[PDB]
Curated annotation (Swiss-Prot):
The modification Arginine amide is found at R35. GO terms for molecular function: chloride channel regulator activity; toxin activity. This is Insectotoxin-I5A. One of its GO terms (cellular component) is extracellular region. Expressed by the venom gland. Toxin with unknown function in healthy organisms. On glioma cells, interacts with chloride channels (probably ClC-3/CLCN3) and MMP2 at the surface of glioma cells. This complex is then internalized via caveolae, thus inhibiting the chloride channels necessary for cell shrinkage and tumor propagation. Has been shown to weakly inhibit TRPV1 channels. Pfam families: Toxin_5. The presence of a 'disulfide through disulfide knot' structurally defines this protein as a knottin. The keyword Secreted applies.
Amino acid sequence: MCMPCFTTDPNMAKKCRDCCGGNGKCFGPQCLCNR
């Protein structure tokens, strides 16, 4: 993964993007990168 994902916060999804250097993809409890 890139890091974790939590569908609680409106700005977590943005934070999962920032983990992948701007361009991530959240897949349930995990945040994964576009790589």
